[PDB]
Amino acid sequence: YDPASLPDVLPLYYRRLFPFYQYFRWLNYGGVVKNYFQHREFSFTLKDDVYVRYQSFNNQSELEKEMQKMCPYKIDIGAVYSHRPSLHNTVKSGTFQAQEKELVFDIDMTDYDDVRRCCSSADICPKCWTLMTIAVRILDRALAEDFGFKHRLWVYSGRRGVHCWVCDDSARKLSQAERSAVAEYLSVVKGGEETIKKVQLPETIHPFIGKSLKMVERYFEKYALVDQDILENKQCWDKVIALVPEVARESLLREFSKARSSVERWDKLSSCLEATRRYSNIPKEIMLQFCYPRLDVNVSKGLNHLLKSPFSVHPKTGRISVPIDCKKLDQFDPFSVPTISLICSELDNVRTRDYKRTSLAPYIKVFEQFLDKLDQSRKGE
Amino acid sequence: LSELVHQILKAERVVIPPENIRNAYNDSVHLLYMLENTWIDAKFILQIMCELNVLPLALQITNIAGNVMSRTLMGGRSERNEYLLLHAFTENNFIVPDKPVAAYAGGLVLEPKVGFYDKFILLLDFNSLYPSIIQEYNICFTTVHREADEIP
DNA sequence: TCACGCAGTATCCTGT
RNA sequence: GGAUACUGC
Ligand SMILES: Nc1nc2c(ncn2[C@H]2C[C@H](O)[C@@H](COP(=O)(O)OP(=O)(O)OP(=O)(O)O)O2)c(=O)[nH]1
Ligand SMILES: [Mg+2]
Numbered sequence: 001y002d003p004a005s006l007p008d009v010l011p012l013y014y015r016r017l018f019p020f021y022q023y024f025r026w027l028n029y030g031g032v033v034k035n036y037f038q039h040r041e042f043s044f045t046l047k048d049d050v051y052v053r054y055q056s057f058n059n060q061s062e063l064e065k066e067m068q069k070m071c072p073y074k075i076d077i078g079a080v081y082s083h084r085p086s087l088h089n090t091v092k093s094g095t096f097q098a099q100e101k102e103l104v105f106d107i108d109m110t111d112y113d114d115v116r117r118c119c120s121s122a123d124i125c126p127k128c129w130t131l132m133t134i135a136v137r138i139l140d141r142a143l144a145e146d147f148g149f150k151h152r153l154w155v156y157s158g159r160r161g162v163h164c165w166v167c168d169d170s171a172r173k174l175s176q177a178e179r180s181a182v183a184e185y186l187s188v189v190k191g192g193e194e195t196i197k198k199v200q201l202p203e204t205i206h207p208f209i210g211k212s213l214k215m216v217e218r219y220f221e222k223y224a225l226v227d228q229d230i231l232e233n234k235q236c237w238d239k240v241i242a243l244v245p246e247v248a249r250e251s252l253l254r255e256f257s258k259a260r261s262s263v264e265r266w267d268k269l270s271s272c273l274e275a276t277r278r279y280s281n282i283p284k285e286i287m288l289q290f291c292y293p294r295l296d297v298n299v300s301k302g303l304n305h306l307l308k309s310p311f312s313v314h315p316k317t318g319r320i321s322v323p324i325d326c327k328k329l330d331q332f333d334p335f336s337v338p339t340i341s342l343i344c345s346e347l348d349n350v351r352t353r354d355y356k357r358t359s360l361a362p363y364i365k366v367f368e369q370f371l372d373k374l375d376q377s378r379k380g381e
Numbered sequence: 382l383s384e385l386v387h388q389i390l391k392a393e394r395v396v397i398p399p400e401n402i403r404n405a406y407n408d409s410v411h412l413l414y415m416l417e418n419t420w421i422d423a424k425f426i427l428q429i430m431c432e433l434n435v436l437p438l439a440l441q442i443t444n445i446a447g448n449v450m451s452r453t454l455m456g457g458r459s460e461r462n463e464y465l466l467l468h469a470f471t472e473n474n475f476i477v478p479d480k481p482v483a484a485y486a487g488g489l490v491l492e493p494k495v496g497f498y499d500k501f502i503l504l505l506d507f508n509s510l511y512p513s514i515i516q517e518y519n520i521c522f523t524t525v526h527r528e529a530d531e532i533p
Numbered sequence: 534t535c536a537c538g539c540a541g542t543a544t545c546c547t548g549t
Numbered sequence: 550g551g552a553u554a555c556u557g558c
């Protein structure tokens with residue numbers, strides 16, 4: 001993909017591929033609340049990194065128009081305000097307030113850098129994507145069981161991670177404090193680059209942590225012991241040794257000198273820890289420190305946060321921010337995600353059904369199913 | 382201005398936040414909207430001026446008193462009466478003073494019988510009380526004998 | 534360079 | 550004791 005080719009393709013996509021009808025269905029939420037779509041904030045990033053916010057639109061036609069006119073490189077969705085953002089200058093000071101917004105989570109592979117060995121920075125590979133695969137299951141289950149949020153849209157971020165939009169009416173009316181509470185409840189791996197032991201579970205395992213460890217276990221052997229090989233050599237297993245009390249460290253080292261496979265080393269570590277009881281949760285702390293999602297509480301706490309819009313185009317990879325089907329999560333491949341160049345090649349190879357002829361169709365289908373569920377909830381209620 | 386427009390013209394005026402005028406220099410639509418807001422504010426000011434009859438009333442008051450119109454429209458009461466009496470005295474062959482380079486008892490408020498009354502209450506009020514007192518008893522500079530705090 | 538009078542009700546505070 | 554408001558005429 002040639003990023004110099006981005007300015008050539010962006011218009012066509014925004015003209016014949018961007019799913020505006022479903023997009024308006026989403027952000028309009030069945031028209032129940034008046035001025036809901038009209039008070040939504042958008043922000044655009046144009047060529048040469050020119051940023052504009054407090055953009056609002058009257059209806060789908062105005063949005064389609066101004067978007068096709070601007071051809072933005074980035075589209076971010078923001079809060080629904082007390083008035084129309086376009087007229088925020090006209091609103092008396094203090095009377096312009098963000099009132100409702102989806103509850104959103106951003107999981108970014110870059111935040112896992114201190115604990116992955118295959119890639120670094122913005123590089124991803126099939127060996128590390130399983131971490132995202134774990135996160136979506138660990139988090140989404142909580143959101144479906146502990147909090148009872150029923151309408152959850154998971155979206156690929158385009159490069160390094162995934163976003164989650166929780167759109168239940170209750171989740172859209174949550175205050176800042178309630179959002180911060182939700183984020184802290186879901187958050188376990190606490191600390192920066194200056195801390196080595198980032199998980200310190202108490203004697204009692206809270207049911208949520210038990211279910212997160214249960215989800216982790218299913219994948220741990222493949223991710224950590226086979227793929228990541230977190231015990232390949234001394235430079236790496238020294239870390240895991242650094243994560244357990246010194247008392248057994250020596251006892252482990254000799255054992256790790258006689259083990260040929262990291263699965264064997266894990267068995268040995270588990271046996272040694274079991275023999276050594278307050279430390280019976282130490283293996284769980286290691287698993288969490290290598291597998292549990294990291295959440296930027298600043299992303300989810302603030303109501304006025306602008307997050308990458310679904311079906312955006314990644315300025316560098318060119319991939320489309322496509323929704324991820326929860327059931328088919330295990331089959332999701334971030335490298336097969338349609339790029340803008342591929343879908344423009346597909347478009348120029350054959351009115352409201354043009355996208356069905358591209359590789360974008362199944363993802364718009366997943367989005368349509370999610371919107372159908374939202375409509376059913378709006379009606380039934 | 383907002384309250385004045387609300388109370389006189391019976392219309393709603395939008396307010397441009399002070400922090401948004403600077404940011405409005407990012408789109409043609411917003412800048413034109415700002416200019417139109419200024420135009421609408423000017424129109425509101427002119428409409429308020431017309432409604433109260435500020436100008437004709439100022440002219441009438443100035444003619445009655447004898448001051449300059451700008452002084453009348455600057456507000457205040459001392460200058461108007463000053464010029465009224467100046468003209469009155471000069472016309473009648475008098476030498477007016479030289480321009481400068483709770484002090485006494487006022488009205489009487491009867492002690493009320495506080496309560497609720499469900500029958501007709503008749504209010505009797507005097508017409509131009511103090512002016513009529515000045516006329517009736519002939520109270521003036523040239524009539525009362527003052528002496529440079531007792532009632533003359 | 535300025536600015537009308539007086540009678541009356543309601544609320545709130547007194548460290549360096 | 551003082552200070553801050555705004556009604557009446
Ligand atoms: N200095 C001064 N005196 C006033 C003012 N308003 C009222 N007064 C005094 C003088 C009036 O003669 C007296 C009587 O009050 P009123 O409201 O009944 O007015 P007045 O009787 O002069 O005329 P009216 O009953 O309205 O036909 O109160 C004022 O604004 N300034
Ligand atoms: Mg009277």
Ligand SMILES: [Mg+2]
Pocket residue numbers: none
């Ligand atoms: Mg006293």
Ligand SMILES: [Zn+2]
Pocket residue numbers: 118119123124125126127128129
């Ligand atoms: Zn990798």
